[PDB]
Amino acid sequence: KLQDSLDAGVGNLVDADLAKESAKLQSLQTKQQLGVQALSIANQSSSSILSLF
Amino acid sequence: ALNSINTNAGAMIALQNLNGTNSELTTVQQRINTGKKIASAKDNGAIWATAKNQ
């Protein structure tokens, strides 16, 4: 009985909640996809200078 | 003098308007990159400080 209590205590100390990690993973994947597109938008600046010359 | 060869104000004013458009574009791109309106202390000092402390 004591060993079961100690195992449960350590698990309570260091375990995670995967239900929350799923939501965080979804939001972060969407944000990374948006960040790549934002970098692509930022790269195409200064390309309009060539028309002046 | 409508025929001056040394200067023309049309180019100056076109340049000024182009620079204004570029500045607005920079602000919008920053909003898109960071995903938030108040990202730094330049955007809004009061709201940025409040959010940091909270």
PDB file of C-alpha atoms in Angstrom, chain B:
ATOM      1  CA  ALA B   1       8.646  78.412 -62.939  1.00  0.00           C
ATOM      2  CA  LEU B   2       6.742  75.557 -64.648  1.00  0.00           C
ATOM      3  CA  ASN B   3       9.805  74.917 -66.844  1.00  0.00           C
ATOM      4  CA  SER B   4      12.666  74.871 -64.320  1.00  0.00           C
ATOM      5  CA  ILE B   5      15.524  72.473 -65.040  1.00  0.00           C
ATOM      6  CA  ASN B   6      17.014  72.521 -61.523  1.00  0.00           C
ATOM      7  CA  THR B   7      14.081  71.431 -59.347  1.00  0.00           C
ATOM      8  CA  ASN B   8      10.580  69.990 -59.363  1.00  0.00           C
ATOM      9  CA  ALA B   9       8.222  69.656 -56.410  1.00  0.00           C
ATOM     10  CA  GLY B  10       6.205  66.834 -57.963  1.00  0.00           C
ATOM     11  CA  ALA B  11       8.985  64.324 -57.370  1.00  0.00           C
ATOM     12  CA  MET B  12       9.433  65.546 -53.790  1.00  0.00           C
ATOM     13  CA  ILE B  13       5.749  65.176 -52.937  1.00  0.00           C
ATOM     14  CA  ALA B  14       5.530  61.781 -54.645  1.00  0.00           C
ATOM     15  CA  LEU B  15       8.510  60.669 -52.552  1.00  0.00           C
ATOM     16  CA  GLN B  16       6.876  61.895 -49.349  1.00  0.00           C
ATOM     17  CA  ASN B  17       3.650  60.013 -50.060  1.00  0.00           C
ATOM     18  CA  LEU B  18       5.579  56.855 -50.955  1.00  0.00           C
ATOM     19  CA  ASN B  19       7.485  57.046 -47.662  1.00  0.00           C
ATOM     20  CA  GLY B  20       4.234  57.417 -45.734  1.00  0.00           C
ATOM     21  CA  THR B  21       2.831  54.327 -47.425  1.00  0.00           C
ATOM     22  CA  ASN B  22       6.019  52.409 -46.616  1.00  0.00           C
ATOM     23  CA  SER B  23       5.745  53.340 -42.932  1.00  0.00           C
ATOM     24  CA  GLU B  24       2.143  52.140 -42.748  1.00  0.00           C
ATOM     25  CA  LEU B  25       3.186  48.910 -44.473  1.00  0.00           C
ATOM     26  CA  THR B  26       5.913  48.423 -41.866  1.00  0.00           C
ATOM     27  CA  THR B  27       3.399  48.803 -39.036  1.00  0.00           C
ATOM     28  CA  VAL B  28       0.970  46.308 -40.578  1.00  0.00           C
ATOM     29  CA  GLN B  29       3.743  43.788 -41.249  1.00  0.00           C
ATOM     30  CA  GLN B  30       4.892  44.035 -37.634  1.00  0.00           C
ATOM     31  CA  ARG B  31       1.326  43.353 -36.485  1.00  0.00           C
ATOM     32  CA  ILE B  32       1.164  40.278 -38.722  1.00  0.00           C
ATOM     33  CA  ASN B  33       4.562  38.959 -37.598  1.00  0.00           C
ATOM     34  CA  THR B  34       4.032  39.234 -33.860  1.00  0.00           C
ATOM     35  CA  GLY B  35       0.281  38.608 -33.939  1.00  0.00           C
ATOM     36  CA  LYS B  36      -0.570  41.474 -31.592  1.00  0.00           C
ATOM     37  CA  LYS B  37      -1.137  45.228 -31.664  1.00  0.00           C
ATOM     38  CA  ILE B  38       0.919  46.246 -28.619  1.00  0.00           C
ATOM     39  CA  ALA B  39       4.108  44.209 -29.053  1.00  0.00           C
ATOM     40  CA  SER B  40       6.801  46.668 -27.950  1.00  0.00           C
ATOM     41  CA  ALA B  41       7.014  49.747 -25.740  1.00  0.00           C
ATOM     42  CA  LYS B  42       6.776  52.069 -28.753  1.00  0.00           C
ATOM     43  CA  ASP B  43       3.252  50.958 -29.688  1.00  0.00           C
ATOM     44  CA  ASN B  44       1.665  51.966 -26.376  1.00  0.00           C
ATOM     45  CA  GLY B  45       3.644  52.471 -23.187  1.00  0.00           C
ATOM     46  CA  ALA B  46       0.757  52.239 -20.732  1.00  0.00           C
ATOM     47  CA  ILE B  47      -0.881  49.112 -22.136  1.00  0.00           C
ATOM     48  CA  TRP B  48       2.456  47.366 -22.683  1.00  0.00           C
ATOM     49  CA  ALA B  49       3.535  47.998 -19.092  1.00  0.00           C
ATOM     50  CA  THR B  50       0.154  46.854 -17.774  1.00  0.00           C
ATOM     51  CA  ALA B  51       0.290  43.617 -19.768  1.00  0.00           C
ATOM     52  CA  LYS B  52       3.869  42.848 -18.702  1.00  0.00           C
ATOM     53  CA  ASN B  53       3.100  43.288 -15.016  1.00  0.00           C
ATOM     54  CA  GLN B  54      -0.133  41.303 -15.306  1.00  0.00           C
TER      55      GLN B  54
END
